[PDB]
């Protein structure tokens, strides 16, 4: 189950 | 032993040549099990290990939708960092992320992590506590403040401590025949003649799983660690690994040297001589 949210820089 | 679930993410800009290359690769322990690539004919999240056939079409649809969202997020990130570092649009740049959790033999969490890098250098990283971030430079500090005031560490901690561990366990259950197996090394030594009365002895170790292994040459008890030439353990294209270690010795006196192979598939370490 891969991460679904990489928050923007 | 302890097991791990790792996701390696990479986003690469290529100005003129279109929109950035985006890839996600997932590993359970040392075995690759899922992949996504934006350059594919039609990009989907797909299995790289047989035991993932046990997930239904709803699993693959959700993963694909996640990936599609992440790609857009890293496109924005790439563009954002151009501003932060004051770089031109013409150059190619790389963002890498590693995310994962590790559990013990009993399935309980040991540690979780996430690290970002820009052009091969540390950018921002989650700490051991899973509550705070650490920023490598001033561009990452801006990001640090965004993520603190949005509570990003709270949502990530929930994923790592909850979701990551729960799915890892399921993967360990579903892929037990593959992931919890132990292929023992087959070892042998090769002889290689050299100039000025010297000889290179190379110890090979083939077809072993898992990847963790120790190769060592000895002479009358002492380990020749500093005098060894080595390669990093490497996949052999079938889910097994290999390694070799070599040392230079004088002609005629080859039998005094011995190679020792330590692996969990070896109840007793191997000892080869020639």
């Amino acid at each position: 189950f891969a991460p679904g949210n990489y928050p923007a820089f | 032993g302890p097991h791990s679930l790792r996701y390696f993410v990479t986003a690469v800009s290529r100005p003129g040549l279109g929109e950035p290359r985006y890839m996600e690769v997932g590993y359970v322990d040392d075995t690759e099990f899922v992949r996504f690539d934006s350059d594919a004919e039609n990009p989907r999240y797909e299995p790289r290990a047989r035991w993932m056939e046990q997930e239904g079409p709803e699993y693959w649809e959700r993963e694909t939708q996640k990936a599609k969202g992440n790609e857009q997020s890293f496109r924005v990130d790439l563009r954002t960092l151009l501003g932060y570092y004051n770089q031109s649009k013409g150059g190619s740049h790389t963002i890498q992320v590693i995310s994962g959790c590790e559990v013990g033999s009993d399935g309980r969490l040991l540690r979780g992590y996430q690290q970002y890098a820009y052009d091969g250098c540390d950018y921002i990283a989650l700490n051991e506590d899973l509550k705070t971030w650490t920023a490598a430079d001033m561009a990452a500090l801006i990001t640090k403040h965004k993520w603190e005031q949005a509570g990003e560490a709270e949502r990530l901690r929930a994923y790592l401590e909850g979701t990551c561990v729960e799915w890892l366990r399921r993967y360990l259950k579903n892929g037990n025949a593959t992931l919890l197996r132990t292929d023992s090394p087959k070892a042998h030594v090769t002889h290689h003649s050299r100039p000025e009365d010297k000889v290179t002895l190379r110890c090979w170790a083939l077809g072993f799983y898992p990847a963790d292994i120790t190769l060592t040459w000895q002479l009358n008890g002492e380990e020749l660690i500093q005098d060894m030439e080595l390669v990093e353990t490497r996949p052999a294209g079938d889910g097994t690994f290999q390694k070799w270690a070599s040392v230079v010795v004088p002609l005629g006196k080859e039998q005094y040297y011995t190679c020792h192979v330590y692996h969990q598939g070896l109840p007793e370490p191997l000892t080869l001589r020639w």
Binding site: - | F8, V12, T94, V231
Partner: protein, 99 residues
Amino acid sequence: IQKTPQIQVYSRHPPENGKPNILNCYVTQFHPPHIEIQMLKNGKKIPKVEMSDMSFSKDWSFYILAHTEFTPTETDTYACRVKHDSMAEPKTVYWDRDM
């Protein structure tokens, strides 16, 4: 930060002529990601090469495996051609089957 790839070429099993085997080209410790990797049989590009085991180490350099099934013969020569920005010229590493 610009690192040259190490290129290692090796078969799955100790090579024996006329026995199915797997040839591997493991390309490691390189940055940036842009890289062209070709597996060659007698100078000709091998058609169906699987790319796998993409990852990176603690210093963020890239690792990637190219591999294909094959059967050795006494005459045939296998090699791995790699192009990367750190190199002046494309590097060709041949398979040493006696290593």
